[PDB]
Amino acid sequence: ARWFPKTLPCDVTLDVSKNHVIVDCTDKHLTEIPGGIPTNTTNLTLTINHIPDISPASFHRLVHLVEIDFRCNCVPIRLGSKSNMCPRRLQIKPRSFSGLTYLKSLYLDGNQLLEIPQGLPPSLQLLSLEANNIFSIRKEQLTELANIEILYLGQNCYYRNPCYVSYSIEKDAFLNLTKLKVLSLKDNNVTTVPTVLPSTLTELYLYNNMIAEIQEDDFNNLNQLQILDLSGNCPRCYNAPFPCTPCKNNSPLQIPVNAFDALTELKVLRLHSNSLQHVPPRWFKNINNLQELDLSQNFLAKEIGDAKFLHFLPNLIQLDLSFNFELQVYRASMNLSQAFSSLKSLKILRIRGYVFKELKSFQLSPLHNLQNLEVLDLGTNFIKIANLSMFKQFKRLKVIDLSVNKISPVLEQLYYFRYDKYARSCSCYKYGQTLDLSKNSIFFIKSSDFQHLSFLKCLNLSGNLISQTLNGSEFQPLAELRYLDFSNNRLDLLHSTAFEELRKLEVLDISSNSHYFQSEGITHMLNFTKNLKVLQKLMMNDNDISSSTSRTMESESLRTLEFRGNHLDVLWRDGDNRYLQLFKNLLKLEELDISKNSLSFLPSGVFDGMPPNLKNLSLAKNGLKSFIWEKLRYLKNLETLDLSHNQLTTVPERLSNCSRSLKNLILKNNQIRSLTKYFLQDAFQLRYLDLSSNKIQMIQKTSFPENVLNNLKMLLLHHNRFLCTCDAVWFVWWVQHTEVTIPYLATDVTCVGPGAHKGQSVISLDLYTCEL
Amino acid sequence: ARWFPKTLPCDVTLDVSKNHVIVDCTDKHLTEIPGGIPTNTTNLTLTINHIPDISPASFHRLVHLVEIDFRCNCVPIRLGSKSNMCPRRLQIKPRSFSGLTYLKSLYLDGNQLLEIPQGLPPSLQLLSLEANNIFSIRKEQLTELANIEILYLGQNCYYRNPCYVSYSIEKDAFLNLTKLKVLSLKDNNVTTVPTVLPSTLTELYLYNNMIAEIQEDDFNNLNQLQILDLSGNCPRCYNAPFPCTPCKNNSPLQIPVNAFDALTELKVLRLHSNSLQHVPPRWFKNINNLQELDLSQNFLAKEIGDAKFLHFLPNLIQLDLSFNFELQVYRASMNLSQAFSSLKSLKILRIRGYVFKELKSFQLSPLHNLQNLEVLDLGTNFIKIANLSMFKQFKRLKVIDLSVNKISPVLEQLYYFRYDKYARSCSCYKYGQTLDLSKNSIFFIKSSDFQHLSFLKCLNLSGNLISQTLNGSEFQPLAELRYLDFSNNRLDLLHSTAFEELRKLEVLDISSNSHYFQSEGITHMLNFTKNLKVLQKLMMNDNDISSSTSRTMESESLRTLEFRGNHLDVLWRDGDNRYLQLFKNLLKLEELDISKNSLSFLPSGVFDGMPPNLKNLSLAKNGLKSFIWEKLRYLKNLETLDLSHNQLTTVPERLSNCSRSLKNLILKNNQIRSLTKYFLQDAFQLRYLDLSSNKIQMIQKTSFPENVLNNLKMLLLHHNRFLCTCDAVWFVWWVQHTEVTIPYLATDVTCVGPGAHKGQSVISLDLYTCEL
Ligand SMILES: *[C@@H]1O[C@H](CO)[C@@H](O[C@@H]2O[C@H](CO)[C@@H](O)[C@H](O)[C@H]2NC(C)=O)[C@H](O)[C@H]1NC(C)=O
Ligand SMILES: *[C@@H]1O[C@H](CO)[C@@H](O[C@@H]2O[C@H](CO)[C@@H](O)[C@H](O)[C@H]2NC(C)=O)[C@H](O)[C@H]1NC(C)=O
Ligand SMILES: *[C@@H]1O[C@H](CO)[C@@H](O[C@@H]2O[C@H](CO)[C@@H](O)[C@H](O)[C@H]2NC(C)=O)[C@H](O)[C@H]1NC(C)=O
Ligand SMILES: *[C@@H]1O[C@H](CO)[C@@H](O[C@@H]2O[C@H](CO)[C@@H](O)[C@H](O)[C@H]2NC(C)=O)[C@H](O)[C@H]1NC(C)=O
Ligand SMILES: CCNCc1nc2c(N)nc3ccccc3c2n1CC(C)(C)O
Ligand SMILES: CCNCc1nc2c(N)nc3ccccc3c2n1CC(C)(C)O
Ligand SMILES: *[C@@H]1O[C@H](CO)[C@@H](O)[C@H](O)[C@H]1NC(C)=O
Ligand SMILES: *[C@@H]1O[C@H](CO)[C@@H](O)[C@H](O)[C@H]1NC(C)=O
Ligand SMILES: *[C@@H]1O[C@H](CO)[C@@H](O)[C@H](O)[C@H]1NC(C)=O
Ligand SMILES: *[C@@H]1O[C@H](CO)[C@@H](O)[C@H](O)[C@H]1NC(C)=O
Ligand SMILES: *[C@@H]1O[C@H](CO)[C@@H](O)[C@H](O)[C@H]1NC(C)=O
Ligand SMILES: *[C@@H]1O[C@H](CO)[C@@H](O)[C@H](O)[C@H]1NC(C)=O
Ligand SMILES: *[C@@H]1O[C@H](CO)[C@@H](O)[C@H](O)[C@H]1NC(C)=O
Numbered sequence A, B: 001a002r003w004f005p006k007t008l009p010c011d012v013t014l015d016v017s018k019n020h021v022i023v024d025c026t027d028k029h030l031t032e033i034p035g036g037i038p039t040n041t042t043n044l045t046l047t048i049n050h051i052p053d054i055s056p057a058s059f060h061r062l063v064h065l066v067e068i069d070f071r072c073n074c075v076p077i078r079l080g081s082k083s084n085m086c087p088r089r090l091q092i093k094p095r096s097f098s099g100l101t102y103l104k105s106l107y108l109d110g111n112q113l114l115e116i117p118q119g120l121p122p123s124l125q126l127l128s129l130e131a132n133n134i135f136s137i138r139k140e141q142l143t144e145l146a147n148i149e150i151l152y153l154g155q156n157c158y159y160r161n162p163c164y165v166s167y168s169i170e171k172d173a174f175l176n177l178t179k180l181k182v183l184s185l186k187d188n189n190v191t192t193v194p195t196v197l198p199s200t201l202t203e204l205y206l207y208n209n210m211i212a213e214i215q216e217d218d219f220n221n222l223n224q225l226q227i228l229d230l231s232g233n234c235p236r237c238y239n240a241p242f243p244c245t246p247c248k249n250n251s252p253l254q255i256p257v258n259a260f261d262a263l264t265e266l267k268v269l270r271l272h273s274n275s276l277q278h279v280p281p282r283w284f285k286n287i288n289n290l291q292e293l294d295l296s297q298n299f300l301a302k303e304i305g306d307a308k309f310l311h312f313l314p315n316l317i318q319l320d321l322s323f324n325f326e327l328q329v330y331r332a333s334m335n336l337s338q339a340f341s342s343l344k345s346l347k348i349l350r351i352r353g354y355v356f357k358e359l360k361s362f363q364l365s366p367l368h369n370l371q372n373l374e375v376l377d378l379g380t381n382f383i384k385i386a387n388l389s390m391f392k393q394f395k396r397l398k399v400i401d402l403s404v405n406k407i408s409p410v411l412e413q414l415y416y417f418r419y420d421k422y423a424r425s426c427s428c429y430k431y432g433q434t435l436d437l438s439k440n441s442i443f444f445i446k447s448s449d450f451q452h453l454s455f456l457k458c459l460n461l462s463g464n465l466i467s468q469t470l471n472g473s474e475f476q477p478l479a480e481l482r483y484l485d486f487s488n489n490r491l492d493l494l495h496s497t498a499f500e501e502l503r504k505l506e507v508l509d510i511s512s513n514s515h516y517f518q519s520e521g522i523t524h525m526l527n528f529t530k531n532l533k534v535l536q537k538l539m540m541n542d543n544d545i546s547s548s549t550s551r552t553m554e555s556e557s558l559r560t561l562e563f564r565g566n567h568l569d570v571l572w573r574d575g576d577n578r579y580l581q582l583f584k585n586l587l588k589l590e591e592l593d594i595s596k597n598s599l600s601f602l603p604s605g606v607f608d609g610m611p612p613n614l615k616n617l618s619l620a621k622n623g624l625k626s627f628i629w630e631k632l633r634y635l636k637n638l639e640t641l642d643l644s645h646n647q648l649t650t651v652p653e654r655l656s657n658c659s660r661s662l663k664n665l666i667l668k669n670n671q672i673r674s675l676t677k678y679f680l681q682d683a684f685q686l687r688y689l690d691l692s693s694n695k696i697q698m699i700q701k702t703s704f705p706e707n708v709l710n711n712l713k714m715l716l717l718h719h720n721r722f723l724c725t726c727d728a729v730w731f732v733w734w735v736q737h738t739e740v741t742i743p744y745l746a747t748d749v750t751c752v753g754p755g756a757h758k759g760q761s762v763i764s765l766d767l768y769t770c771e772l
């Protein structure tokens, strides 16, 4: 199928439309730039290798390069692997880049460089030098960058990559960069705003530095600026997860009342962790276009009850005031200034970490007539009391977020406290109105708790303390609810009428409710599904279910059942036939996950007990030591079979004789040491096959007929025990010449032997002596 | 050191005092009895192999055998491995046992035998034939057993090993076994009590059968019987975890009032799962000695309120009345008859599964003057209300068990419901008075909850819903408490005064309280230990701890800290020095478990930050990819180092130069491929070394000096990658001749190659061609 096998250890992709030739050698354990890179290459990526040097030889033939991505070949010690430390900084020899007349983007982040690389071609639009050791910026070193438009210099002096001095920037070092639009000097030990900056700037990132004061004219000429981030200058250090040094005298970042007067195009202003105690209204007198304001992690608790500056922000879309509470103070209630009602455009309001005992409806009246408000986030406030009926006046909202509180009758998990959320490395909302009560202290629920909340589409009760026999009465008002997340509670399924009042429920999650399933003698009605007439997906993972009072689960609607992390091995104890049809009467079930059920064997009868339309079956991670492949004939609609992470040792003699429907067969991480002689014969309908991480030594053509292989959408073979003897000649030739997608050919499709060939890639194997 | 290497794949022990030669071939994957078993062998065990036959050659030379243990070489299908099913039942040829003039004990359980083996020697005292296929007992087949005292015939016809007919016993089949003391016919589909039985019987096991009625004279002659078990005849089938057929019309096992009149020596009567509705006092008229009565899994709920029979049981030690509740009945309270007060000798009372809402002090008054009472078990009753102060009248008890209830302001976990708790296979009580409130619904606690309970030594609150900031006030009456189990709650360690009122506390378990450690920005005072002045052991496993407001834990008493299952990798983020001394001021800490903390590397400063008297350190299961062995020099008292289940690839060049104190070094399940040339040179304090489950190919003599090997109590080497070439000549010879204890030589110290030798045990390897 190929006359010239590809030996290059990189992926090569063809973007005919914009004439791009993409060569991606990411994470190929290279110690040199590989030979034979195509001369037409436009995008060359060498990220995460151990190439110690660049020289004119490096890209000599590659005159068409628009982008070199050479990140993280020598990353700073505390940021990189401690098992493969980089011994010496990347060495760049003169005029390695000057021949590349078309080069627009150069990424050299994370190479321990000491100076800005010189000799760069004047076509360059983007230069990236994050996580190097460059902490002095001189005008002279920037002359080469006349046409530069995006310049990243951050992370060159901070606690994970120290330079032990203040960052240095020469007066007007950036000024004659007349095209520069984005400048990022974050995480750099910078002490003053650099001046004068070019008025072309649209984005300026100065956050996480040691700037104590803003001068009146620091931003005087920047009439095109759209994003300004000054966060983390004079940080609020309480409970900081990183080493945190505050400004002296509990000082805030000092910003003169007129400092932003020139910023008429500013759409985003970030003032997170600046220890602000006041927000002067005068700041925003000439900014009418501001859309996003971040004021989290300051000391604005009292300002929130006053907040006159809000009257100047009628175009604001997002307001963040999270974590402004006064230390050691547990307020009685939330005091929102009436000025919030002048925020006519607000869609997102976040006030986590205000820290107060009781929320009452009148406290939210300033928001009552904000017509665009879509998200109200009051998480992590330790609220003990809130009458949920209160939110009848907020039907228009998409998400009401009370997550992580103490109520009783999606942002990353580190978000407000992490050092740099934007550091670069080397859900039920769509169903409609969401009330998120997850991670609260709700121990008991009753219908009145949800009075006037009939409009709700998703209710998140995950991680409460609900330890209750539901009988169909607790959710009566929730007549529109489509999604209930009830995971991490203590559901007691005594009654098969549980949840039946949720007559429009489509998704139910009762995962991690194992408490009552763990003790003998307790009644469990797993047939509670019959009463849920539009239920589409049921999750009951990690419930430790090893017994059931009912012997069948019933549903004519359910299409997906997740049953992972239970004890079907106990339910299907050999000799006990009573539960072999547990799933049989889920007539429209197509996907069944019964991985992690300690199923070391399948008793006869489980396959005949499967419902008739089963399409996706997972039996992964069961410790399965044997498997009657012929029993797959009962599964007449089977398309995906996941047998990964087991102890299987054989494949079927004729996959076509076991299932002439199967498309995806996943056998990774088993103990298979050989294939049957006619394994895939006539298995035409097959499209995806994972044999990786087994012990296969040989594969002959009879097992892998090409009438089958070339309609394979992927074939995974890596991490086996291939023996590269003259018996392997067909397999080696076929692998070298096939166009079927096989991952990790360059890195993990390897001979274990004999001796000479140990560790050698099958792709590079020369077997001419077999033909002499 | 040995002139004749042992090649026999069995363990051989010498018990010089009792003149025993013990040969243990348990689970050696033998398909034949090995040659060369010592002629003096007295105890031979071949359990769990695949030896298909026994013949006169089997034990030909072994005339001194007192015991043959040949269990489970062909186990019934539903009881055995489905990956290695036994193809044909064990074959015993004639006269295989008659030459064994001293044979006292013969175990042939689980071999699918069809008849009682004939030709047995007249010395035999014990025959065991459980889990075979013998379901007709004839007097003729028993004549050979004249001297038998112990006969196990159960598990030959039941749902896990069906015979599809009723068990058959000939009239007086057992009568002429005049020495028989123990007869077990459990799990056999028996339909009547066999008669007449020999009057020597002391123990009769007839449980899990199909006996519907006892005849009035079925036990008439058994004036020596001490234990009678008739349980599981007419079973109580509700929520049974095995296929269960009740007698119909809800009939009980029918027992005439005089059926026990002859059993004057009876000490144990088991009537579990017999569907009893009454316990006639007349049953016990001539049983004056009964000590143990099991009446669990009947329908005695109403009888418990009357219970006139208890007046005839003044010597009873143990009474079990668990799971007698009426189906679908949730009683208001528990009604214990006054007759319980006549149980003068009672030590243990178990009444689980009575199922009632409210426990109150007056309900237990019949027990107030039972002076010998030690255990009151009221678990699994769904009690919602209980004033714990009532147990002030129960200071003499050792354990008050309210586990698994719904209270709100040690038996196996399958015990009452499993089919045969005695089926054979092929904790804080010690501190004093214990109140076990585990697995209840306690969400909030206050001091008054423990009013009058100052005598308690151990309190188990595990698995409740306590989601509360403790501040030192909640446990004030518990002035003698030595052990608090607070695991699986939702501890909020806001205050460093938590638990400080428990001034005699020695052990605290706060494991699996991860809830509030999972959300960012929440204050955690891990320095709460300072106030606990006699605390010896602290468990805080599986708390997901990744942040702390305090930087150090402090204690003058703590000796053991379990800190497993947290995120020290995040706390010790490279470049953040603030937590590197978290444990430094636990000045008396001797044991530290920080396994499972995602520590893929150890930041420098961790070892210098350890407290000075640390002796046992676990770093297991961390994904550790590298390790600076020289840093062990900081741990001048280190004796045990557990690095198991990591990714290490090297050992130190000279262990003695890293730690002068190290005695136990555990390196199992790593990636070590070779040892350093002088690894163990002069490591004179080393005593235990585990290198199993690595990738070692070769070991040379320089690495293993003999003056060090002579002090090793164990050296574990199994499951490596040994290369059995002429280069391995020292190691192969040394392994064959050493006296150092090396486990699994017979089974898992194996050549991986070259070719001819794959799978061969190095103990069997012949390398003479290397020496020609
Ligand atoms: C190949 O490299 C070019 C050069 O950087 C990439 O083109 C840039 O793509 C971003 C994505 O929107 C644009 O903002 C830049 O303006 C583009 N620059 C030019 C000169 O066109 C391109 O994305 C890369 N393609 C791949 C597949 O890596
Ligand atoms: C940021 O710059 C400060 C100084 O502006 C550095 O602090 C100095 O560090 C040296 C070397 O450790 C000390 O000897 C001086 O006493 C420090 N001076 C002051 C004024 O603090 C600091 O190390 C730099 N931070 C990083 C992360 O590189
Ligand atoms: C070796 O076999 C003898 C004979 O079966 C065992 O001796 C019996 O041990 C039990 C347990 O202590 C006693 O109750 C019996 O009284 C002993 N004698 C008989 C005739 O059964 C002995 O325990 C075995 N030893 C080992 C190490 O297996
Ligand atoms: C226990 O004995 C009964 C008979 O006393 C067995 O039941 C019979 O089984 C055969 C074949 O399965 C049926 O055709 C009969 O109808 C059954 N008879 C009755 C009276 O039910 C039963 O199989 C035996 N149990 C075991 C585990 O062997
Ligand atoms: C040993 C009990 N077995 C049956 C049983 N199961 C449960 C259960 N899951 N939850 C409960 C919650 C409250 C009260 C009782 C139960 C209960 N009961 C007892 C009864 C309702 C009479 O069936
Ligand atoms: C945003 C969190 N700031 C630190 C904090 N942690 C906790 C905690 N673990 N538990 C609590 C329980 C009740 C009320 C408050 C807290 C609380 N607070 C707030 C503080 C003012 C210090 O009390
Ligand atoms: C809220 O705070 C504001 C300003 O700090 C002030 O009007 C008043 O003290 C508070 N009002 C209420 C109703 O609590
Ligand atoms: C909660 O508020 C609603 C107002 O919609 C009211 O109907 C209900 O009585 C209140 N409940 C409590 C417990 O205050
Ligand atoms: C419910 O909230 C939990 C806890 O934050 C979250 O992990 C989960 O994804 C949410 N469920 C849905 C369906 O969004
Ligand atoms: C369900 O339980 C609720 C809550 O206690 C109760 O009001 C109602 O009577 C019960 N309904 C049924 C049908 O059992
Ligand atoms: C589920 O099975 C139990 C078994 O007794 C039965 O009581 C109940 O009627 C069944 N489920 C229904 C009716 O949804
Ligand atoms: C308890 O039940 C027994 C049995 O019916 C009855 O005789 C007795 O009067 C009851 N006593 C109480 C206090 O309920
Ligand atoms: C519990 O009983 C004790 C009697 O020892 C009494 O002092 C206390 O008031 C009772 N508590 C409650 C809540 O009834």
Ligand SMILES: *[C@@H]1O[C@H](CO)[C@@H](O)[C@H](O)[C@H]1NC(C)=O
Binding pocket: B403, B427, B428, B429, B438, B439, B460, B461, B462, B463, B483, B485
């Ligand atoms: C407390 O009870 C739990 C739950 O039953 C049990 O697992 C644990 O071992 C008990 N703790 C002690 C110290 O006995």
Ligand SMILES: *[C@@H]1O[C@H](CO)[C@@H](O)[C@H](O)[C@H]1NC(C)=O
Binding pocket: B471, B472, B473
């Ligand atoms: C500790 O909490 C208890 C329970 O609310 C309270 O009574 C007590 O005053 C608190 N003590 C301190 C010192 O805050």
Ligand SMILES: *[C@@H]1O[C@H](CO)[C@@H](O)[C@H](O)[C@H]1NC(C)=O
Binding pocket: B496, B497, B525, B527, B528, B530, B531, B549, B550, B551
């Ligand atoms: C624990 O350490 C913190 C330091 O963050 C301090 O506020 C507190 O007083 C300390 N408490 C004790 C008991 O040492």
Ligand SMILES: *[C@@H]1O[C@H](CO)[C@@H](O)[C@H](O)[C@H]1NC(C)=O
Binding pocket: B633, B656, B657, B658
């Ligand atoms: C390790 O060995 C070197 C060289 O023999 C010696 O100088 C050094 O003191 C030793 N260190 C320890 C801790 O034994």
